[PDB]
Design a protein around this ligand. Sequence first.
Ligand SMILES: *[C@@H]1O[C@H](CO)[C@@H](O)[C@H](O)[C@H]1NC(C)=O
Ligand SMILES: *[C@@H]1O[C@H](CO)[C@@H](O)[C@H](O)[C@H]1NC(C)=O
Lengths: 50, 145
Amino acid sequence: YNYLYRLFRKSNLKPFERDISTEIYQAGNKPCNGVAGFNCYFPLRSYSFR
Amino acid sequence: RGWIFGTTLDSKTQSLLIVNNATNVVIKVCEFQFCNDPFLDHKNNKSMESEFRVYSSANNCTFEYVSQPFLMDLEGKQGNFKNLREFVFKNIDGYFKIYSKHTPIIVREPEDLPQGFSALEPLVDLPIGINITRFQTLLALHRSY
Ligand SMILES: *[C@@H]1O[C@H](CO)[C@@H](O)[C@H](O)[C@H]1NC(C)=O
Ligand SMILES: *[C@@H]1O[C@H](CO)[C@@H](O)[C@H](O)[C@H]1NC(C)=O
């Protein structure tokens, strides 16, 4: 659980640019305020190598 | 002295800063929490060297660069002449370029820039990968004296 990756982001990245932001992504109109389950997802999901 | 950059100027996004102490540039690409009205002290504020108050925290650090100051201008010669420092800041494809050129000025009027051609020679290139959307400058105010 030491290797993470990003799944959802608002827009595409520019070349050779790095992000580290950890903010809740809003797929729905209703705001999430950092804590929600519907139409709101945590941006990062971890790998799990076996 | 000081050209901090940032997307929203807080501790949740990385930021830049260009601080020339007397002989160094101290390039720092780190996550900084910035005060409402950051400022510095021209006279070294005595100190020791206790002027720095722009940032109150640093969660992470990725890039560091220390070298000779950007400002080769010296005022120790005499007065009656002012500086004409010029800088162009261009940020593309994850790169940061700096161009600079200094010329003396004859007329004391600061109303308008003198009419004259100047070539801005390249100075330094930066490989950092930050996004910049807002611009802020800093000042050196030691004390009312
Ligand atoms: C200014 O700050 C730099 C940062 O490390 C330090 O090396 C230097 O000694 C300080 N003082 C002067 C006069 O440059
Ligand atoms: C920023 O600080 C938080 C404090 O909870 C820490 O968990 C996080 O790892 C830090 N950022 C990075 C990139 O490590």
